[PDB]
Design a protein around this ligand. Structure first.
Ligand SMILES: [C]C1=C([C])[C]=C2C(=[C]1)N([C][C]([O])[C]([O])[C]([O])[C]OP([O])(=O)OP([O])(=O)O[C][C]1O[C](N3[C]=NC4=C3N=[C]N=C4[N])[C]([O])[C]1[O])C1=NC(=O)[N]C(=O)C1=N2C(=O)[C][C]C1=[C][C]=C([N]C(=O)[C]([C]C2=[C][C]=[C][C]=[C]2)[N]C(=O)O[C]C2=[C][C]=[C][C]=[C]2)[C]=[C]1
Lengths: 133, 666
């Protein structure tokens, strides 16, 4: 039925080590090289990666920005509306980013806005222009 | 087994089925009704039993029927038919019994037996016991042939056969009750000792062995499952098969290592890409912070587009920091899923140089078992006799096996120092021409009805022939002589004035340095009452050592031994002997084996007797004249003492049937 377990013997394998007198030591020598060849390439990418880790040194730590803990709100100050209208021109439909920029509006208060003031901020025009980039 | 079925088993027969053999003599019964077969079988088994329970006295038809009950002892033509077949074929009253009816008066027919081997002797006894006229012709000046035993002072060692492979259904078991042989068991415990002279640690000892056995089954698998049996026209040997397996084992060792590092790279290269993506992000981030800084310096109050700029870049920045945090995340996983892969490589090697050396001793043992280089054993058939194993512990003859052939010898007409040179067989009889081994001009002619030839196979193979056949042996027979293998194996007997080995140990091995010398002095036996060590030379080595002087050999021997026991625990030996069986002209080797391109079938060919042509042409087809026995002739017990012994019984039966007729097949 099956070869004793831990012995490996393929029909196909056998015909391959027998094909000639030293198909034996041939096939065993391709792999010997096929190995040192992978094993060398491993050290290239070990060094290549090592030098890239060199650059990422210290991380992005000095570039991080403090925490903006500010509570959501009902009122659109005229300031916020303008901030909005500009965010739209730059962000399109990314209500998350838009919300993030205006600082204190919920990701929907935003979408709401999109329909209420749609009227008078020609949000059509604005939106099709963001597309044109 | 025990009871009556014990006997059937101890006699090598199925207790509840009739043999092909029996079918031929009792074709009435076996084609008969089931009920009768059972009656028959019982009678057989029961008689066997009786004989067995007491094999030091002949067992007569009377004495037999005597111990039977009905329904069994009802029909007595049956009992007679049975007891008589059993007697003929040497299942009962063989060996050395005391005759109840001292030998019937004048004798019928005359047979010359070539060689007083065990096969020789056992047949001779049988024939004589059947009241024929028997003479054995022996080239040597002693009986036994390949059962040679060294005797001198108190030293006693066999240079020939030495082991009894278990009493369970072994005819020798009977013989052992009949003759005083001290049988000692063989504590299977055998420590190995590398070239240096250092024991091998149980840790390895067991790795290697177990791998050995694993390798064996492997070959069996290639043979029966993958059908790897021919190879550019030549038949595959066990040797090839073993290499081809070992190679494949080495191959897969690499195959693994490859696809293991091949995994490391694929990962190391994922890490690469991510690191690049990571650098180029710190890049945007650096210079995007700049921009937020510059636009945050425009001090308020600012108009709304300049306020939007600050606000906006601040998102765009925390956005890109999210991203890069999620990447140093991913980075961490991969960097450890890599100390992971470097932690568990797969196996470095298939076997070390020290391993593959010990594995060699295991092969030497196999070469010893088969008396031959594994490169010569048939892959398909090397172990075809693998069912007919005896049961029980293996044994040795503590007082020299020769005690047996000498005992068989007793009461027989034996001509020692008589070298057969020509066998002439014709329609109306045979003549055998021998010479005197001492002065060889001194010639002899023996006339007889039949010749039983127990020449060793080695002898039968000789080129050009040591014995001439007249007429020549048919080509069907002489091809079977080529095809079969006749191996070699040699012993070295070391006699000392003190024990300096572990007395509790029967055998211990020495591990050679190369494959090429795996057989050379590879194993030692502590067997006897005296301080005698006995050392083997098997494999490719045995043949080569025959060309080397005795001193040199005992040299290499003591070396190895000091090597293990300390350079002054080992005295010079009082007495040494070295066998050379391939050289010995009445052996020309040690015992047969199943050479690649042979099969068990050749053994059956060896046993087929020869029937001469007709004298006056158009006269009736003759009687067969020339018969064969010997270790090489018994398909199911090749190369052994019990095997020979049996082949002797066989031919005697067959010859008697021929020349005294068979009253029992009615
Ligand atoms: C050499 C040798 C040695 C050294 C050793 C041994 C041997 C050998 N073996 C063998 C025997 O010996 C033989 O076979 C016999 O003996 C033979 O006999 P015969 O046949 O009879 O013959 P011979 O003797 O030779 O005779 C002949 C005669 O002739 C004469 N001549 C010649 N020429 C001439 C003449 N004459 C006149 N003219 C002329 N021309 C001569 O001279 C003579 O006389 C053995 N065996 C046994 O049994 N034992 C032993 O021990 C032995 N040995 C050893 O050591 C070893 C071997 C062996 C093998 C095997 C065995 N067993 C078996 O095989 C079985 C199998 C099986 C398996 C599984 C299953 C089943 C079965 N068993 C077993 O178990 O196996 C395993 C083993 C192996 C090995 C070891 C152990 C175990 C045994 C043994």
């Amino acid at each position: 039925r099956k070869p004793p377990k831990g012995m490996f013997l393929s029909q196909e394998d056998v015909e391959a080590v027998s094909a000639n007198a030293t198909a034996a030591t041939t096939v065993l020598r391709q792999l010997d090289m096929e190995l040192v060849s992978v094993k060398r390439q491993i050290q290239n990418i070990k060094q290549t990666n090592s030098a890239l880790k060199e650059k990422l040194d210290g991380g992005i730590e000095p570039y991080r920005l403090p925490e903006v803990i500010q509570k959501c709100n009902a009122r659109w100050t005229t300031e916020e509306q303008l901030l909005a209208v500009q965010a739209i021109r730059k962000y399109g439909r990314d209500f998350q980013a838009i919300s993030d920029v205006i600082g204190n509006k919920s990701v929907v208060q935003v979408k709401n806005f999109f329909v209420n003031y749609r009227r008078r901020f020609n949000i059509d025009e604005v939106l099709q222009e963001w597309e044109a980039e | 087994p025990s009871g009556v079925e014990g006997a059937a088993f101890q006699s090598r027969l199925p207790h509840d089925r009739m043999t092909s053999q029996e079918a031929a003599c009792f074709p009435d019964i076996i084609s008969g009704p089931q009920q009768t077969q059972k009656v028959f079988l019982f009678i057989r088994n029961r008689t066997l039993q009786l004989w067995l329970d007491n094999p030091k006295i002949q067992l007569t038809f009377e004495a037999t029927l005597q111990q039977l009950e009905a329904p069994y002892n009802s029909d007595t033509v049956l009992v007679h038919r049975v007891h008589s077949y059993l007697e003929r074929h040497g299942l009962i009253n063989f060996g050395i019994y005391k005759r109840i009816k001292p030998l019937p008066t004048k004798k019928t027919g005359k047979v010359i037996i070539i060689g007083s081997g065990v096969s020789g002797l056992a047949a001779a006894r049988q024939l004589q016991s059947f009241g024929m006229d028997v003479t054995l012709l022996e080239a040597r000046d002693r009986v036994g042939g390949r059962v040679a035993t060294f005797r001198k002072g108190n030293y006693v060692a066999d240079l020939g056969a030495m082991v009894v492979t278990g009493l369970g259904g072994n005819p020798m078991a009977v013989v052992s009750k009949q003759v005083n042989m001290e049988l000692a068991k063989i504590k299977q415990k055998c420590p190995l000792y590398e070239a240096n002279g250092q024991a091998v640690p149980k840790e390895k000892d067991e790795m290697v062995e177990q791998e050995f056995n694993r390798l064996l089954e492997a070959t069996s698998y290639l043979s029966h499952q993958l059908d790897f049996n021919v190879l550019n026209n030549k038949p595959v040997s066990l040797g090839q098969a073993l290499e081809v397996v070992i190679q494949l084992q080495e191959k897969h060792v690499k195959d693994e290592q490859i696809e293991h590092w091949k995994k490391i790279v694929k990962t190391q290269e994922e890490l690469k890409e991510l690191l690049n993506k990571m650098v180029n992000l710190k890049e945007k981030i650096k210079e995007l912070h700049q921009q937020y800084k510059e636009a945050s310096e425009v001090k308020p109050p600012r108009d709304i587009t300049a306020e939007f700029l600050v606000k906006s870049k601040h998102r765009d920045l925390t956005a890109l920091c999210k991203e890069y945090d999620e990447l140093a995340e991913t980075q961490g996983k991969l960097e450890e899923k890599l100390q992971e892969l470097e932690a568990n490589p797969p196996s470095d090697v298939y076997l070390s140089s020290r391993d593959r050396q010990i594995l060699d001793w295991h092969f030497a043992n196999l070469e010893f078992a088969n008396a031959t280089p594994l490169s010569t054993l048939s892959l398909k058939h090397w172990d075809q006799d693998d069912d007919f194993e005896f049961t029980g512990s293996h044994l040795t003859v503590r007082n020299g096996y020769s005690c047996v052939p000498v005992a068989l010898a007793e009461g027989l007409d034996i001509k020692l120092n008589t070298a057969v040179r020509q066998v002439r067989y014709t329609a109306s009889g045979c003549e055998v021409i021998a010479v005197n081994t001492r002065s060889t001009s001194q010639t002899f002619i023996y006339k007889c009805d039949a010749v039983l030839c127990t020449l060793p196979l080695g002898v039968l193979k000789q080129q050009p022939p040591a014995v001439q056949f007249v007429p020549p042996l048919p080509e069907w027979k002489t091809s079977a002589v080529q095809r079969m293998g006749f191996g070699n194996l040699n012993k070295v007997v070391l006699c000392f004035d003190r024990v300096f080995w572990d007395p509790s140990v029967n055998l211990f091995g020495h591990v050679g340095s190369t494959t090429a010398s795996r057989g050379e002095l590879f194993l030692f036996w502590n067997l006897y009452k005296a301080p005698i060590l006995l050392a083997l030379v098997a494999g490719e080595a045995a043949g080569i050592m025959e060309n080397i002087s005795d001193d040199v050999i005992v040299g290499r021997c003591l070396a190895i031994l000091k090597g293990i026991f300390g350079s002054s625990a080992v005295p010079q030996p009082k007495e040494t002997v070295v066998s050379r069986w391939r050289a010995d002209p009445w052996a020309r080797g040690s015992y047969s084996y199943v050479a690649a391109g042979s099969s068990g079938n050749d053994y059956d060919l060896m046993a087929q007797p020869i029937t001469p042509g007709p004298s006056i042409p158009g006269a009736p087809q003759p009687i067969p004249r020339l018969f064969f026995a010997g270790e090489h002739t018994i398909r199911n017990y090749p190369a052994t003492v019990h095997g020979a012994l049996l082949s002797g019984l066989r031919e005697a039966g067959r010859i008697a049937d021929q020349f005294l007729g068979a009253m029992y097949t009615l």
